Paper text:
Of particular clinical importance is the widely disseminated class A SBLs, including the mobile, plasmid-encoded extended-spectrum CTX-M and carbapenem-hydrolyzing [name] families (both produced in opportunistic Gram-negative bacteria, such as [name], Pseudomonas aeruginosa, and Escherichia coli), as well as chromosomally encoded L2 from Stenotrophomonas maltophilia (a lung colonist of cystic fibrosis patients). SBLs hydrolyze antibiotics via formation of a hydrolytically labile acyl enzyme intermediate, while MBL catalysis proceeds without a covalent intermediate. The diazabicyclooctanes (DBOs), including avibactam, relebactam, and others, are a new BLI class with improved activity against a wider range of SBL targets than classic BLI scaffolds. DBOs inhibit SBLs through covalent formation of a carbamyl ester to the active-site serine concomitant with DBO ring opening.
Of the [name] carbapenemases, [name]-2, [name]-3, and [name]-4 are the most prevalent in resistant Enterobacteriaceae, differing from [name]-2 by single- or double-point substitutions at amino acid positions 104, 240, and 274 ([name]-3 H274Y; [name]-4 P104R/V240G) that change β-lactam specificity, especially toward the oxyimino-cephalosporin ceftazidime. Relebactam cocomplex structures were obtained after 16-h soaks for CTX-M-15 (1.12 Å, P212121), L2 (1.78 Å, P212121), [name]-2 (1.04 Å, P21212), [name]-3 (1.06 Å, P21212), and [name]-4 (1.04 Å, P21212). In the [name] variants, structures obtained from diffraction data sets collected after exposing crystals to relebactam for 16 hours were observed to contain both intact and desulfated (i.e., in the imine form) relebactam in the active site, at variable occupancies. Consistent with this possibility, in the [name]-2, [name]-3, and [name]-4 structures, inspection of electron density maps indicated the presence of desulfated relebactam, which could be modelled as the imine form of the inhibitor, with occupancies of 0.35, 0.33, and 0.65 for [name]-2, -3, and -4, respectively. The imine group points toward the flexible Trp105, but otherwise, the DBO core closely resembles intact relebactam. In [name]-3 and -4 relebactam complexes, Trp105 is modelled in one conformation, similar to one of the two conformations observed in [name]-2, albeit with high B-factors (30.95 and 33.19 compared with average protein B-factors of 13.61 and 13.24, respectively), suggesting there is still flexibility and movement of this residue. In this conformation, Trp105 faces the DBO core, with the nitrogen of the pyrrole ring ∼3.0 Å from the relebactam imine N6. This is concomitant with well-defined electron density for the relebactam piperidine ring. However, in each of the three [name] complexes, in all of which relebactam was a modelled as a mixture of intact and desulfated forms, Lys73 is at least 0.4 Å more distant from Ser130 than is the case for either the CTX-M-15 (either conformation) or L2 structures.
Author numbering: 25 to 57, 59 to 252, 254 to 294
The structure:
């Protein structure tokens, strides 16, 4: 049921000047669209969705976790911390940092939450615990964005991203209340309007998390999509390119998402 219908991903990536990796699953039939799906691509900010899921998993054992207020210093505010910079003088709760990391891609929030989990290895351990043997987080913000060609640090594959996203949003990897909180955070993302969402009809529900490393044409998005009248679709679209100053493209991500939906025979 993989690639029943071929789609022109090769032409798309050639025009982009790099590589595009796609994995999309129709959770009803199990049909898939797969292109470069087992290659590694940098996560960039996209690790923050999984980070929030890991915090939610912890919260199942620690009922006071999400309400815990976290104070932080000005030194915590690395570049691109749009929410946490507004609460420097007050603090934010763990839940609020999680929402900020997911919905505004807040970097300070992400580092504070990584500390809660025991760092990159702690997040990696959570991903192993759900059966993902591909994901690896190695570094913190901002160093994890280097996106060096051939470097496996801070990467996953489109396939493993999709598989893990399915387990966490639709499967049993989180308890039901936490699963719905994760979904709600993804649905409230503000940074993805020009990526997978641009390929998804306005009357379908969707949650996503983006990433943009800033170098090597490297950017991404993953999403759960609920078309009306049929089972949800999970998909991941990752890009990279050979040269350090190659620019990412949101349009290319949207276009790859459209091809994926077409390949699944989802009328959109
Ligand atoms: C994540 O990849 N980020 C965080 C933020 N927006 O995330 S995104 O998924 O919407 O793109 C800005 C881009 C990126 C990031 O951390 N970039 C570094 C900090 C800002 N200067 C460039 C490198």
């Amino acid at each position: 049921l993989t690639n029943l219908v071929a789609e022109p991903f090769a032409k798309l990536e050639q025009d982009f000047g790099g590589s595009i990796g796609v994995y999309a699953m129709d959770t009803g039939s199990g049909a898939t669209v797969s292109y470069r799906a087992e290659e590694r691509f940098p996560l960039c900010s996209s690790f923050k969705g999984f980070l929030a899921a890991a915090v939610l998993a912890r919260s199942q054992q620690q009922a006071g976790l999400l309400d815990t207020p976290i104070r932080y210093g000005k030194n915590a505010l690395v570049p691109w911390s749009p929410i946490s910079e507004k609460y420097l003088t007050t603090g934010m709760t763990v839940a609020e940092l999680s929402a900020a990391a997911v919905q505004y891609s807040d970097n300070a929030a992400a580092n504070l939450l990584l500390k809660e989990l025991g760092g990159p290895a702690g997040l990696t351990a959570f991903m192993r615990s759900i059966g993902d043997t591909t994901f690896r987080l190695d570094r913190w913000e901002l160093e994890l964005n280097s996106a060096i060609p051939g470097d496996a640090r801070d990467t996953s594959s489109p396939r493993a991203v999709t598989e893990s996203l399915q387990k966490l949003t639709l499967g049993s990897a989180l308890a039901a209340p936490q699963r719905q909180q994760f979904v709600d955070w993804l649905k409230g993302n503000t940074t993805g309007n020009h990526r997978i969402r641009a390929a998804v009809p306005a009357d379908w529900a969707v949650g996503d998390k983006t990433g943009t490393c800033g170098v090597y044409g490297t950017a991404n998005d993953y999403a759960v999509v609920w078309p009306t009248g049929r089972a949800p679709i999970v998909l991941a679209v990752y890009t990279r390119a050979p040269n350090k100053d190659d620019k990412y493209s949101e349009a290319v991500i949207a276009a790859a998402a459209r091809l994926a939906l077409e390949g699944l025979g989802v009328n959109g």
